[PDB]
Ligand binder design. Sequence first.
Ligand code: MG
Lengths: 102, 469, 407
Amino acid sequence: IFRDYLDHIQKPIYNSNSITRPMFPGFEAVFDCKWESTGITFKEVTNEDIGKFLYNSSTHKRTYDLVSLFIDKIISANKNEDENVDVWFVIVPDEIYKYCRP
Amino acid sequence: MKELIYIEEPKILFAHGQKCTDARDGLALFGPLNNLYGIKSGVIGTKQGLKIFRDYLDHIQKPIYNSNSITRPMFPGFEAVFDCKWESTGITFKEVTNEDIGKFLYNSSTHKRTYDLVSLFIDKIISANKNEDENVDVWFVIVPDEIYKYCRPNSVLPAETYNYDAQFHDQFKARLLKHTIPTQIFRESTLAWRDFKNAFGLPIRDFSKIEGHLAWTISTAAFYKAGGKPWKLSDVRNGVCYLGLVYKKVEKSKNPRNACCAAQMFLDNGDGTVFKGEVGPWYNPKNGQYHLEPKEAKALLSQSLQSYKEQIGEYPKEVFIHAKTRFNHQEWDAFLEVTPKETNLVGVTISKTKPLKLYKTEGDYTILRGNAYVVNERSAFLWTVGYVPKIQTALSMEVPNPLFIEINKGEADIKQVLKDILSLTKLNYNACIFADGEPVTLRFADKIGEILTASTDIKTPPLAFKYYI
Amino acid sequence: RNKIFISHATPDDNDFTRWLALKLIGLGYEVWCDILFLDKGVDFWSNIEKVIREDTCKFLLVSSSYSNQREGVLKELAVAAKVKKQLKDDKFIIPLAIDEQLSYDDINIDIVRLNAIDFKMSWARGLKDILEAFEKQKVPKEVADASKSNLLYQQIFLHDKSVIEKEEIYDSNWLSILSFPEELRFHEYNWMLPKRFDVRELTFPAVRYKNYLCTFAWAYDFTYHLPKTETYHKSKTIRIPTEEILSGSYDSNFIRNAECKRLIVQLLNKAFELRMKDKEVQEYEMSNKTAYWLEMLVGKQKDKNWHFAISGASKLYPFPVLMISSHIFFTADGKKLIDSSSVQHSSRRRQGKNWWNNTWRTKLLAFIKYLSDDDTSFYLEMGSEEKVFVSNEPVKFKGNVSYNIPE
RNA sequence: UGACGGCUCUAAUCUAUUA
DNA sequence: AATAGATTAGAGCCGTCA
Ligand SMILES: [Mg+2]
């Protein structure tokens, strides 16, 4: 999904009404910088763990487990590797967002 | 009469699936594997240091030549080589006032002033990383010469901070480990060498004839530290794992308490090259002894096997444990009590303290590089340093020494061991050279060991080499 | 017409010309240049004009302080101008400026009015400009290929220099041990010799072991130092031949094989030390070993004379040898060593700078040959009637691969 | 600490024997 | 606490042209 979306916004995008909402002329035509799917560094997270954790019936416990799962990976990637990554985008399934309220 | 054997060059791989024996030639002809877009650099230092770094970056956008183009390939420019942008406009500056530097470098105690200076620099680096918007790929630390002169452990000046190494470089690199910030340390006399002179009007270090070599080295280090893949080995076989071991002394404590660190290398199965440290420092309480107790040996081998299995999906078919020492029977019994049934564990010892020198009878040029003398089915000498006909010169200046390789344990074929040891000399990402004199499994493990021996607070350190080298 | 003609100064613009020609050949173009050919000669002229007149499609000129006012370049430009008039192509000649010392107002009259491609500030953008110009003018080209460039590179700078099948012989720093006495013997002076005698000062090499004496010497040798030895029953001497313990086929509760080998090595080292004392050669106590030197093997370096020196250690693996090392030591006047280790380090670092392979090996063989006893050997006196014979020529090694040393 | 190579100086530990 | 042999690690200086 992320790769699709990044490829999409490299070209100009228009709205239905161009007065209320001025067009989007494309990412590089606007921001004078390169952001494509060539400077990505994937960190696969198997759906098995995510599914397993989100069944404990205790909201605080499962929130803690999910946050730990994600941040451990992000921190290891930051610290123990030579790669330079600026913004760490987190794609989260919908069910995780829905069930993470008090 | 004794008989020698020759071993052919291993060759390395570049972009477009093209093979070459040299890294400079293959980088100038073909280019690197992956596609970076550009290096955004953060520069922490004084004002003059920032100007020096800017001037150097403006200098390596163009061709730079050596004195001789055969002995030393020339540099056609950073963007010509690496197909990415590293220019002095994507720079963020974090000023370090000179008054603070002068203040802290006077306490008459090496440990305290070293701690104060490392704290000074890493405070700014950490604050910038935590609470700012600019993205930085590598941090370039410009250091004056006065700081470099007096911060060595055996440096004379003409308790709380005593639990640290008295070396600025190692303490700096260790105290930034839990943040995972790639950094490159530069002296001020390295980037602007023409300006620093002795009391005769001449440079202390003369790079006049080797400017292109310096540009190659610095550019390759910067490219690798920012997430670039310059090259890889071309004939790594499947199911083989290479494991280095090196010992250091955790000095400055009641117990010398030797520690051990390992480095790993195998094939990705995607035709890549996995080359990362395998370290959680393992200790031996007894002084002077460089052997693992059974528990530590079991833990080390179990961890390495599990890492290989997780990356590949199966256990290795062969494990070569390169080391600078011999193994005892307790060590190898502990090693063999966790290895899978259908795996072959071979323990090789690479020694350098063994006098032997071959002299050609006629010329003033030394023995050819890849020569070897096989004493026995379990021993052989190997010349990793010697004349290379490709560059019409040798890798040393006097008569070079060979390596004494011994199959200490297991059952292997010595010729293949020599062939594998020669190829491992072609992965020194910390330099841009024709070839190294030692396998890189035993060198990067040593670097890691000497980095995470300058502090005691390190837990579960990173394994990517860009945070140590 | 497929060729792209590059004109330059042969000995001066070689680096840039080679770089650009190889880059263009990698991109897939066809290039003609005088650095792309071997076995030249009568090729010059009568073939340059033919290629300019009948094969060239673009005439790239490298403009620099060296190519300005050069006869060959100017003549080639004249031919190229005539060819440009002959065809309907105003963009047939494309100057390339690279020399920062060539001001754009100091250009020769032939190209003062032409639009050039700039290379001074960087070569990457100049290459891009050339590529865009060629694409805009529709210059012929094939599919891009750089393996072709590597193959061509080899045909010139790899054949002129690769490894060659050639049988050579080397000299090493090992000296084989030729003779061993027949039977090492242990003399039982059970509480007869003094308890703190410091047996290292005796006339022949000895080594205490239990209540015995490990030596190669004869039963009633060293009687001057041990007066009460004549009354000694010789049958209590535990005699073990040297060959059996050397081959490893001897072991008993009294002594193991490894211990016997170690004591033999100790005896050999002490014998070498004593003999070098006999040879009347100067000493130099290094950090852990001792060196030897003579008061060319001695020479001059400014205010300090350099002295070639050797140190010797005897080993039983791979085979019984006497390994030799090489050092340099410095004196104020050829007779007294300078008592400064830092100065010695600096002097030895700056003196071996100009010493190549032949110097090292010749000096080593000269020093070793000077210690030779009679004709081909050198003996270590282990006793009154016992000797260990050592060679004066080092061991040779053979190999089938070498290089051609093409100056 | 931009590399690499070659040197020199200073500690240990083990093994055998003697006190 | 001595005499060896044999094996390990640590610091620190010097050269790279021709
Ligand atoms: Mg580096």
